[PDB]
Design an enzyme around this catalytic site. Structure first.
Site, short mmCIF file in Angstrom:
data_model
loop_
_atom_site.label_atom_id
_atom_site.label_comp_id
_atom_site.label_asym_id
_atom_site.label_seq_id
_atom_site.Cartn_x
_atom_site.Cartn_y
_atom_site.Cartn_z
N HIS A 72 -37.60 0.10 68.08
CA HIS A 72 -38.79 -0.40 68.77
C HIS A 72 -38.74 -0.05 70.26
CE1 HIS A 72 -38.63 -2.90 65.08
NE2 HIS A 72 -39.95 -2.84 65.15
N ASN A 73 -38.97 1.23 70.54
CA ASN A 73 -38.96 1.77 71.90
C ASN A 73 -40.26 2.52 72.18
OD1 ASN A 73 -38.76 4.55 70.87
ND2 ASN A 73 -36.74 3.83 70.18
N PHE A 74 -40.32 3.11 73.37
CA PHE A 74 -41.51 3.83 73.79
C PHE A 74 -41.93 4.97 72.88
CE2 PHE A 74 -43.69 7.14 76.31
CZ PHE A 74 -44.87 6.43 76.54
N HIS A 76 -41.62 5.04 69.65
CA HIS A 76 -42.26 4.43 68.49
C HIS A 76 -43.70 4.12 68.90
CE1 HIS A 76 -43.33 1.86 65.20
NE2 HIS A 76 -43.49 0.82 66.00
N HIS A 112 -48.88 -2.80 70.75
CA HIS A 112 -48.30 -3.62 69.69
C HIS A 112 -46.81 -4.03 69.75
CE1 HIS A 112 -46.24 -0.32 67.73
NE2 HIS A 112 -45.83 -1.16 66.80
N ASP A 113 -45.95 -3.27 70.44
CA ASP A 113 -44.53 -3.66 70.52
C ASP A 113 -43.97 -3.80 71.93
OD1 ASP A 113 -43.68 -4.12 67.85
OD2 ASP A 113 -43.53 -1.96 67.50
N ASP A 222 -48.57 1.61 62.27
CA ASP A 222 -47.33 0.96 62.71
C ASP A 222 -46.08 1.30 61.90
OD1 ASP A 222 -45.72 -0.84 64.23
OD2 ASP A 222 -45.91 -2.31 62.59
N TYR A 244 -31.37 -2.88 62.79
CA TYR A 244 -31.14 -3.92 61.79
C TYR A 244 -29.66 -4.33 61.80
CZ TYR A 244 -35.75 -3.38 59.56
OH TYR A 244 -37.10 -3.38 59.28
N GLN A 273 -35.26 2.52 52.16
CA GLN A 273 -36.57 3.13 52.04
C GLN A 273 -37.21 3.16 50.66
OE1 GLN A 273 -38.05 4.20 55.33
NE2 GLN A 273 -36.50 2.58 55.26
C1 LIG Z 1 -38.54 -6.35 54.27
C2 LIG Z 1 -39.03 -4.97 54.68
C3 LIG Z 1 -40.56 -5.02 54.75
C4 LIG Z 1 -38.41 -4.66 56.06
N1 LIG Z 1 -38.78 -3.32 56.60
C5 LIG Z 1 -39.68 -3.21 57.64
O1 LIG Z 1 -40.19 -4.23 58.12
N2 LIG Z 1 -40.02 -1.99 58.16
C6 LIG Z 1 -40.98 -1.91 59.28
C7 LIG Z 1 -39.46 -0.82 57.65
O2 LIG Z 1 -39.74 0.28 58.10
C8 LIG Z 1 -38.50 -0.91 56.54
N3 LIG Z 1 -37.80 -0.01 55.84
C9 LIG Z 1 -37.08 -0.62 54.95
N4 LIG Z 1 -37.29 -1.97 55.05
C10 LIG Z 1 -38.19 -2.18 56.04
MG LIG Z 2 -43.97 -5.39 65.62
ZN LIG Z 3 -43.99 -1.69 65.37
#
Ligand SMILES: CC(C)Cn1c(=O)n(C)c(=O)c2nc[nH]c21
Ligand SMILES: [Mg+2]
Ligand SMILES: [Zn+2]
Ligand SMILES: CC(C)Cn1c(=O)n(C)c(=O)c2nc[nH]c21
Ligand SMILES: [Mg+2]
Ligand SMILES: [Zn+2]
Lengths: 324, 326
Positions: A72-74, A76, A112-113, A222, A244, A273
């Site tokens: 979550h940086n610039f 993004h 947004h972020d 997003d 994460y 993913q």
């Molecule tokens: C629980 C799941 C929705 C979490 N989650 C998320 O929020 N984003 C934005 C991702 O890109 C993503 N990729 C795997 N899980 C993800």
């Molecule tokens: Mg957000």
């Molecule tokens: Zn975002």
């Protein structure tokens, strides 16, 4: 002879319009220019009388209010806005939305972020952080993003809305707030059903319908990394997990609950993913296709590919873990 | 002998249970004692291992965090809290509610207006205030009252929940946040409908049914001045309009819009309460009476009276301005 980088070459201005635009090839400066061009290009500078110099400062001040987080940086920030930009063309949004709405989608995407701390709402709440306490546990992150967005737009030198009647500001502010708060994944399911509901008989004239669509639209942009070309898409998965894991570790040191999907000992680029693409991304983009069918070939297509690629990639990983 | 004021007489302690309590006689300290007594008397100090001293430092801290607005001040804070107390008895809430809900209702009432600025949400938004910006035009005042509440409880010496297990904490926080945020009159209608809807077939064992009841309960306590005796109620109306006019003044000289009901030129102590009592107060307490009939006579009664009195005043009030104006 040879012009500086912050002078987008006519080729760049062409690629910028598509979801394929390699987001990694530019430096903040260049990206800032891209965003700038976007506002002029969409006629926003024009239709609202945005002082061009202000637009410059605003974007610069925006870039300064984004932390250097792995995900979550610039950059993004840029991705979402650029993806929103892409969809404005791909879907001919200017045929369905008023210039004001377009202003909202774009400004909202860019903000947004703002000042995202690198830790999600679940952490903010358990750690009982200032954000959590300040926002009474209600989407503290998104609420903060939104607040910072407007703290900036309150600086006269950054107020890209300085020449909009007060009646308009209110409508723009409302819309942005709605959209930015709609990006809290906690509300994903809820938002999707509301949309899926009105979808049974969509109505571009109905206001509530349109608000949901704008909500769905910003959400799409997003979390649209996987829509992007496989080379530009993959590196972001790393950035994400990097964040994460940073949180899952901290949560462990501090004895706070640890979400499995963030657990460094249970997560892999693949398993992360596959579920997200199959069960969140595809379905969402799927329903959006009902309204803009050209989205299937441009965004749903790469998603199906990334799903297969990642699914096969796990298939492989399991075989290896097996040999051992 | 002749004990000091902060020492409640058994008469006061007895008076503290009825809505007829003269919330005007007492001073901050004495009121703090009354509040303190409620937490003991309701079994909260007992059932929640509240350190009896922390309870006092907390009440002190809460009091110190209320502004000196003509209306939205600590004495109002005490009114709502003392009204809630009365409600618990009059309606035998300890029968329908867990001690945790009783805790929530009391603490939420005591904190419901923490650090109130003196200007409503409309002023906050229109004037694009620091609060309006912080909470993105969403019940910025209530959201604030709520935040301050928990920052206070974040202080170890003021933390009356220090001996409650973390799960119970989360549970209480959630409830408090819901009730405080529910006092935003902008939601009065929405909330009323939800309650009246769940009221079609009320179920004391349904969590959602009980959450609306508690929201309705705190709302009732929040705007319950007119339920009190004529001489205890009336002076509050003045206090409110003093705060209302202060806003409309500021608003006029800042080019910000002004609400008619806050316009110095179109509002009399009377016109303000006649409508409010007939369309907000009575209606609400009425549906609440379906659930608790004893409520009609102890509260719906003084309201009809108040309504009739103000309507009477408005006539002589009107006649008077028919001698004024050229
Ligand atoms: C629980 C799941 C929705 C979490 N989650 C998320 O929020 N984003 C934005 C991702 O890109 C993503 N990729 C795997 N899980 C993800
Ligand atoms: Mg957000
Ligand atoms: Zn975002
Ligand atoms: C939003 C709120 C100030 C409205 N409000 C109120 O709370 N009380 C107690 C009144 O007597 C009153 N009269 C008009 N509006 C009123
Ligand atoms: Mg209030
Ligand atoms: Zn109040």
């Amino acid at each position: 002879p040879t012009y500086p980088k912050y002078l987008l070459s006519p080729e760049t201005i062409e690629a910028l319009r598509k979801p394929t635009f390699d987001v990694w090839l530019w430096e903040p400066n260049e990206m800032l220019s891209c965003l700038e061009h976007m506002y002029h290009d969409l006629g926003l500078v024009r239709d609202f009388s945005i002082n061009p110099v202000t637009l410059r400062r605003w974007l610069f001040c925006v870039h300064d209010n984004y932390r250097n987080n792995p995900f979550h940086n610039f950059r993004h920030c840029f991705c979402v806005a650029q993806m929103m930009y892409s969809m404005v063309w791909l879907c001919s949004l200017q045929e369905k939305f008023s210039q004001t709405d377009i202003l909202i989608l774009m400004t909202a995407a860019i903000c947004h972020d703002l000042d995202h701390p690198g830790y999600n709402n679940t952490y903010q709440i358990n750690a009982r952080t200032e954000l959590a306490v300040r926002y009474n546990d209600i989407s503290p992150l998104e609420n903060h993003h939104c607040a910072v967005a407007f703290q900036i737009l309150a600086e006269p030198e950054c107020n890209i809305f300085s020449n909009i009647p007060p009646d308009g500001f209110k409508q723009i502010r409302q819309g942005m707030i709605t959209l930015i708060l709609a990006t809290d994944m906690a509300r994903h399911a809820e938002i999707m059903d509301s949309f899926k509901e009105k979808m049974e008989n969509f109505d571009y004239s109905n206001e509530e319908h349109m608000t949901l669509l704008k909500m769905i639209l910003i959400k799409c942009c997003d979390i649209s990394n996987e829509v992007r070309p496989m080379e530009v898409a993959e590196p972001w998965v790393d950035c994400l997990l990097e964040e994460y894991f940073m949180q899952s570790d901290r949560e462990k040191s501090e004895g706070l609950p640890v979400a499995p999907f963030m657990d460094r000992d249970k997560v892999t680029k693949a398993t992360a993913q596959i579920g997200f693409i199959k069960f969140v991304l595809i379905p969402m983009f799927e329903t959006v296709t009902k309204l803009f069918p050209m989205v299937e070939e441009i965004m749903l297509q790469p998603l199906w590919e990334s799903r297969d690629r990642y699914e096969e990639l796990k298939r492989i990983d399991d075989a290896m873990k097996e040999l051992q």
